[PDB]
């Protein structure tokens, strides 16, 4: 019966909440208070990357920690040489409303997507001197909000319709589909072993997915509004979410709970980009208040601020060796920090 | 200092910057428009007529080019997006204007249209963006009022005390009852607009039909007014 099914679902949710409460004996802050604080963090702008016409929605670091791809609403992907601020490539797009971009771990391809509902993949290393579209992936009904490369042939995309999809690139057909969300899916983050990934949606819930199995292993419901950004701790057993309720949150897959919330009374704007450091001690979060903040992931106190942008920060990414942090905003400027 | 290959790389970057400068010249000279409306609202007919007169299975956006007096316009309407709008609407906060096409001859889904227009107007990212609303299907409205089969006072009781504004200007000249009804609808929309306008953005009403060929001219004039007020704000004139 439908009523019996609803009652069973409610009872099982209550049991899950009770189990989560029982498994929690001491909060992360109460245990971590006995570690010396990192103190004030002094980070300054080293380079500024001019050239994007319009506001920037997307940015992804290279695996070589020197190349950088950026996507802006004017309809361009620019590959910057971060050390010299030179432009390596200028990729014009068919759809100007691009609001996600990824850089392949090998460095041979870049992906992008947006309101066109298509995830386009470009071949950086061709026999010709130009960059050309490798393949265009179709099948999502809503706008594509995030894309991440597993390898040179597998990509994972999240879309406006309540569905994530795993794609084969050689054959345009979707290898696997991920359903279960009830709102727009906004952000996505692959595991260090590229076996699991999370999706943050507009249902204020984050789901831990299984790439091969194709099923939602876990669900995290702690936020009060839609989730805008999400990323794993470098350990690979935890992730952090930034939402419109002006609070960041750290979830743990193994505990299947919420560890800390990074919130302040003065901040009221919602976070739009989240990224950790290499040790995971710094949680850098972009905000709508024109400035990016730096949080201590172990004490939940705001260690520093990266404030140099003339409009809200949309994208944020920390390089693989941890030597720098790139920050992109709607003022059409990328800033390299150290 | 730096090697000869680095000179050649810097020259390549300079060439890329030259291409970006030409692209900037093209980009700055074009005004972007976001088309909005319900299914019954004849925005599809409007965009088809504009495409005919002036200038893919699950695609999420439809792009339309039209040019009036050597001024470029791109008008975008979303095709495959869900009923939710609060997320992908943030991409359209730098457009010149939002064209909200509304059906005024329905009398049943019109309150839903007012709610949608109120949500668009009060959006935190859609501020300082002037909205051009097209009160579409005027001939259907006149026919339905003259027929008398359906009335408006039942859906909106405030119509009973409503009287025709002194500024009403029916150009062709017809029954004052249809003029009173259409100006009542327009005044409801303008009341929603002026409730929280705060002077940051304006609202441009138009009694139009999807068959009308003057819609492009109306959009051009409204966009010229919007750009004029933006330039007056930018050039420290007010």
């Amino acid at each position, epitope marked *: 019966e439908l009523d019996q099914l609803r009652q069973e679902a409610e009872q099982l949710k209550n049991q899950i909440r009770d189990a989560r409460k029982a498994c929690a004996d001491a909060t992360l802050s109460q245990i971590t208070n006995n570690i010396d604080p990192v103190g004030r963090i002094q980070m300054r702008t080293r380079r500024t990357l001019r050239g994007h016409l319009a506001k920037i929605y997307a940015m992804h670091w290279g695996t070589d920690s020197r190349l950088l791809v950026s996507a802006s609403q004017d309809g361009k992907l620019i590959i910057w040489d971060s050390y010299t601020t030179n432009k*390596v490539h200028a990729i014009p797009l068919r759809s100007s409303w691009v609001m996600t971009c990824a850089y392949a771990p090998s460095g041979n391809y870049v992906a992008c997507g947006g309101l066109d509902n298509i995830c386009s993949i470009y071949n950086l290393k061709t*026999r010709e001197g130009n960059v050309r579209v490798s393949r265009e992936l179709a099948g999502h009904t809503g706008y594509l909000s995030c894309c991440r490369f597993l390898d040179d042939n597998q990509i994972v995309t999240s879309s406006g319709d309540t569905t994530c999809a795993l794609w084969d690139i050689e054959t345009g057909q979707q290898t696997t589909t991920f359903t279960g969300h009830t709102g727009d899916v906004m952000s996505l983050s692959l595991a260090p072993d590229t076996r699991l990934f999370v999706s943050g949606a507009c249902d204020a819930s984050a789901k831990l997915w299984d790439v091969r199995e194709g099923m939602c292993r876990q669900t995290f419901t702690g936020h009060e509004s839609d989730i805008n950004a999400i990323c794993f701790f470098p350990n690979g057993n935890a992730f952090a979410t930034g939402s419109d309720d002006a609070t960041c949150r750290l979830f743990d897959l193994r505990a299947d709970q919420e560890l800390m919330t990074y919130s302040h009374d003065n901040i009221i704007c919602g976070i739009t980009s989240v990224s950790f450091s290499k040790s995971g001690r710094l949680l850098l979060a972009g905000y709508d208040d024109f400035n990016c903040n730096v949080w201590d992931a172990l004490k939940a106190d705001r260690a520093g601020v990266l404030a140099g942008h003339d409009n809200r920060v949309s994208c944020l990414g920390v390089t693989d060796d941890g030597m720098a942090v790139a920050t992109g905003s709607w003022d059409s400027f990328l800033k390299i920090w150290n | 200092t730096l090697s000869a290959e680095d000179k050649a*790389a810097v020259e*390549r970057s300079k060439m890329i910057e030259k291409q970006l400068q030409k692209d900037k010249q093209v980009y700055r000279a074009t005004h972007r428009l976001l088309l909005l409306g319900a299914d019954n609202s004849g925005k599809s007919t409007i965009v088809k007529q504009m495409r005919i007169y002036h200038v893919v299975k699950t695609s999420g956006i439809f792009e339309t080019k039209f040019q009036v007096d050597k001024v470029n316009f791109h008008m975008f309407d979303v095709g495959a997006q869900r009923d939710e709008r609060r997320k992908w609407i943030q991409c359209f906060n730098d457009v010149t204007a939002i064209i909200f096409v509304v059906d005024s001859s329905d009398y049943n889904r019109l309150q839903e249209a007012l709610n949608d227009f109120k949500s668009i107007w009060n959006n935190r990212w859609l501020r300082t963006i002037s909205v051009i609303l097209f009160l579409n299907k005027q001939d259907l409205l006149a026919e339905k009022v003259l027929a008398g089969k359906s009335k408006i006072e039942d859906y909106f009781p405030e119509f009973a005390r409503y009287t025709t504004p002194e500024d009403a200007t029916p150009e062709p000249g017809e029954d004052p009852r249809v003029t009173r009804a259409k100006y009542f609808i327009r005044d409801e929309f303008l009341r929603i607009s002026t409730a929280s306008g705060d002077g940051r953005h304006y609202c441009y009403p138009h009694f139009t039909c999807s068959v009308d060929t003057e819609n492009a001219r109306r959009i051009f004039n409204d966009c010229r007014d919007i750009i004029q007020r933006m330039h007056l704000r930018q050039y420290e004139l007010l």
Partner: single-chain antibody, 229 residues
């Protein structure tokens, strides 16, 4: 991708001739191009270089005023205009393609070449070993007058393998990076002044002449090279 060049013939001394290089199959405008010649019995010698967009044109010290180089991007062709053709110009002029960005591989493709016959300073001199050296391993070595290591960290050392037949094809750029299409057997080594190219398993197709090249500063000196038989 391909580079076809023509315009080679017997020329009386003191005359003028124009070499053309027709390119097809790649983005011509994004590639800077070079002219590299070899005498019939000598090694390769760099001639000229024109950059992408014609913003940077270089010439060798021996060809500084006699030759001029120009490109036609709409026509997708490259020209070399020759003036005052002396007797020391009888060589095999090659048309070379090169691009420059972070991680690019310059000199990656070469044309077929043209044969020209004429009737009767403080630069990094690159010196090779003796030009006389299946299944074995060979360790062709080279030496540089000046250190090729730059403050950037890239040592601009290039390896070219010319078969007894067709034109040279790039093997290793910047002493460590195997070019596209080259088998994994080839490897490059060095320390800043002396460099060694190693083939881990000789084959029948590895026979030919190995030329080295430097790109730290113009002119692009090559060296005599070594022969494998």
């Amino acid at each position: 991708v391909q580079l076809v060049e023509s315009g080679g013939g017997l020329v009386q001394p003191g005359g003028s001739r124009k070499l053309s290089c027709s390119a097809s199959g790649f983005a011509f405008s994004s590639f800077g191009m070079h002219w590299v010649r070899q005498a019939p019995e000598k090694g390769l010698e760099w001639v000229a270089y024109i950059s992408s967009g014609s913003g940077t044109i270089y010439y060798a010290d021996t060809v500084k005023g006699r030759f001029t180089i120009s490109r036609d991007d709409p026509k997708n062709t490259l020209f070399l205009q020759m003036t005052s053709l002396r007797s020391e110009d009888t060589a095999m002029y090659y048309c070379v393609r090169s691009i420059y960005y972070y991680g690019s591989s310059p000199f990656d493709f070469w044309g077929q070449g043209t044969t020209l016959t004429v009737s009767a300073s403080a630069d990094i001199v690159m010196t090779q070993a003796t030009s006389s050296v299946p299944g074995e391993s060979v360790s062709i070595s080279c030496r540089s007058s000046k250190s090729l290591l730059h403050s950037n960290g890239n040592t601009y050392l290039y390896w070219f393998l010319q078969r007894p037949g067709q034109s040279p094809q790039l093997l290793i750029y910047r002493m460590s990076n195997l070019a596209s299409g080259v088998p994994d057997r080839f490897s490059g080594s060095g320390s800043g002044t002396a460099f060694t190219l190693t083939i881990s398993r000789l084959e029948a197709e590895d026979v030919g002449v190995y030329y080295c090249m430097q790109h730290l500063e113009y002119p692009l000196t090559f060296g005599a090279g070594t022969k494998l038989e």
